Amino acid sequence: EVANPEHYIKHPLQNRWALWFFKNDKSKTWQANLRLISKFDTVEDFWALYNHIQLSSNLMPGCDYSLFKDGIEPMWEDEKNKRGGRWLITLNKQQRRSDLDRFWLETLLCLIGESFDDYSDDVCGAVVNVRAKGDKIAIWTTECENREAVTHIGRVYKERLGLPPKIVIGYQSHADTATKSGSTTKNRFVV
Ligand SMILES: C[n+]1cn([C@@H]2O[C@H](COP(=O)(O)OP(=O)(O)OP(=O)(O)OC[C@H]3O[C@@H](n4cnc5c(N)ncnc54)[C@H](O)[C@@H]3O)[C@@H](O)[C@H]2O)c2nc(N)[nH]c(=O)c21
Secondary structure (H helix, E strand, C coil): CCCCCHHCCCCEEEEEEEEEEEEECCCCCCCCEEEEEEECCCCCHHHHHCCCCCCCHHHHCEEEEEECCCCCCCCCCCCCEEEEEEEEEEECCCHHHHHHHHHHHHHHHHCCCCCHHHHHHHEEEEEECCCCCCEEEEECCCCCHHHHHHHHHHHHHHHCCCEEEEEEEEEEEECCCCCCCCCCCCCCCCC
């Protein structure tokens, strides 16, 4: 003889997530400008957070928002990111108005909804970069050598965002990040 949980319990998410903010400051290290906002693990708590913060579209150029599974820091050095990479979405200046905010929300929902099904374990989180030269959004995965998982995640993500199918996107390995003044990171896969 107990109350029906459907009438009062919050709707749980498979994982607990953490949202981070990056504030641009040249006089300090990258890590020093990165700070945690808060965490949540239910549908209700996700909306409570999203509804009171600024849309990416309104942030000052140079700042970022990052949503990662609790325990995984949004940086290359992390145990779960060092051997991984990211599927990169490169937006033009006009998309700041038309697609940035809509794309970022769909990205958030793809993560907390575990929309990559059988390859959910390879997903680490996502990052949106607000920049004057052109905004960027990316989904980070844990292992660049897991071809099956990486290509499936890329396909689903591209489909969910809904941009024209003829547009190809690439996946970059973090370890491959350019360090030689005169080169640029190449793509491991494309979908
Ligand atoms: C995600 N992330 C970014 N930075 C730092 O932030 C910078 C700007 O990275 P951004 O992702 O916010 O990208 P942004 O749009 O602001 O602009 P941008 O692409 O122009 O610059 C990064 C790129 O510059 C190039 N680069 C940096 N240093 C060198 C170098 N010595 N030689 C050749 N290319 C370089 C690379 O292609 C690199 O991917 C990086 O160059 C790096 O110091 C990080 N540092 C640590 N330690 N861990 C991280 O996880 C991290």
